[PDB]
Design a protein around this ligand. Structure first.
Ligand SMILES: OC1(O)[C@]2(Cl)[C@@]3(Cl)[C@]4(Cl)C(Cl)(Cl)[C@@]5(Cl)[C@](Cl)([C@]1(Cl)[C@]53Cl)[C@]24Cl
Ligand SMILES: OC1(O)[C@]2(Cl)[C@@]3(Cl)[C@]4(Cl)C(Cl)(Cl)[C@@]5(Cl)[C@](Cl)([C@]1(Cl)[C@]53Cl)[C@]24Cl
Lengths: 9, 241, 235, 10
């Protein structure tokens, strides 16, 4: 999930 | 938790410092825009704004205290409301027009290019008109935006663990209410005026919720009409609904 | 000039309490509804009958009959489903985990599954009921909230008069919280919490409108012309 | 034409 990724970095 | 100990002035300061930037579109006055290409411009812009929104959310007091699953859910629920209220805020000084970007200022008649966009444009214009009617302040606006992020998903969340989560968001929300009242008191409003204005401000969030759901339906329409290109992140955000 | 602005807070509350519509019963099918058609039949039948009472309730909300007929039509068209849903949630409050559509029709989310797309709205309604329950929502606060919905949900789809009546209802809510002994900080905090739920009620109504439209297109049950016209106004 | 118009007037 793109949003999942973006929140993590 | 750092969020819960913040003072009213520090909350305002933290929210003002976290404000994302205003981005430019690829609009070219000389280039002819179809129904589609104007929609490609706006969805291109929204996709870039979503990246800044995600990183803005991390700076909202209390947001990073939540599980990453909770963070994902709040943004999935709130993202369109947040884009729209920012659009309304930017357009407040341009009556009858929507300032999608500093180089892209559209009016109702041009919003008739994309089938279905006229109705949502009118609601956004009606909201901007209300913001002007109430003389909405920038400090009030950043409070409203953080309330949307925290509130819009807090009732569609399991265990007693996921319930302590919901309980923390409520304390942060109450802190933002205290901040709103603090601002109105400083501006010299009577207590009756502070409560009336507080209510007027939060009632707008119902209209923003309404516009968001109408907008989510328009974006899903665009999607499987498959004429306007749509980014992978927008498509995932769309699927969340 | 409108009589609504001259009433007191207590007169406002009493006028709102007196205008409350009755709680209606469902058809007495002694069968636990387990089919989509019988489910949708019972509920839309109830909704049709409640709508007639809502329209007559709305005429007793102070300030409402002072608007033009076209404005009254517009406000009710925009708000009718929010108002039915907040009433459902209110009636269901003292029944955790269940939705009291009528005293003889109390359902749980297991029965929301009998209808395609219904368990999702069912869970939103149940969460709202629990939220009201934990906040100890009072009947005087509930009737203020319901009238705020009526006057607010369509007011930006156009004003001065409605916003003054809206302010008057805010004053009434505060008045009710002060009477209950709450501190000033508790008063504006509780006012905020209450009004923020109206955002969730708006969301549930939008999802409910979508579901009702799909069931219209599914032709699962005949809908009354009144209910159809209330639906059509949301395009 | 709408039923709502008529019920509001009754
Ligand atoms: O401001 C938006 O985010 C919003 Cl809310 C609208 Cl108004 C809709 Cl409803 C459409 Cl589909 Cl018309 C489009 Cl292109 C999207 Cl992606 C943007 Cl950029 C506009 Cl302009 C969406 Cl979802
Ligand atoms: O409470 C309602 O008014 C509401 Cl809001 C729901 Cl929850 C939906 Cl969304 C469905 Cl279609 Cl499930 C149905 Cl049958 C309708 Cl007619 C009633 Cl009676 C329910 Cl139970 C509608 Cl519009």
């Amino acid at each position: 999930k793109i949003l999942h990724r973006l929140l993590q970095e | 938790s750092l969020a819960l100990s913040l003072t009213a002035d520090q909350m305002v300061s933290a929210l003002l410092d976290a404000e994302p930037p205003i981005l430019y579109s690829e609009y070219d006055p000389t280039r002819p825009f179809s129904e589609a290409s104007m929609m490609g411009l706006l969805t291109n812009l929204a996709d870039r704004e979503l990246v800044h929104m995600i990183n803005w959310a991390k700076r909202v007091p209390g947001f990073v205290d939540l599980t990453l699953h909770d963070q994902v859910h709040l943004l999935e629920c709130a993202w369109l409301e947040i884009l729209m209220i920012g659009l309304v805020w930017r357009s407040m000084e341009h009556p009858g027009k929507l300032l999608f970007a500093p180089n892209l200022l559209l009016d109702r008649n041009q919003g008739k290019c994309v089938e279905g966009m006229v109705e949502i444009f009118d609601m956004l214009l009606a909201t901007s008109s209300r913001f002007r009617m109430m003389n909405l302040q920038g400090e009030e606006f950043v409070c409203l935006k953080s309330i949307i992020l925290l509130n819009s998903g807090v009732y569609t969340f399991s265990t007693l663990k996921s319930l302590e989560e919901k309980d923390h968001i409520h304390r942060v929300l109450d802190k933002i209410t205290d901040t709103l009242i603090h601002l109105m008191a400083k501006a010299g409003l009577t207590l009756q005026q502070q409560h009336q204005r507080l209510a007027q401000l939060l009632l707008i969030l119902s209209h923003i919720r309404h516009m968001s759901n109408k907008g989510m339906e328009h974006l899903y329409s665009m999607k499987c009409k498959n004429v306007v290109p749509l980014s992978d992140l927008l498509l995932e955000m769309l699927d969340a609904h």
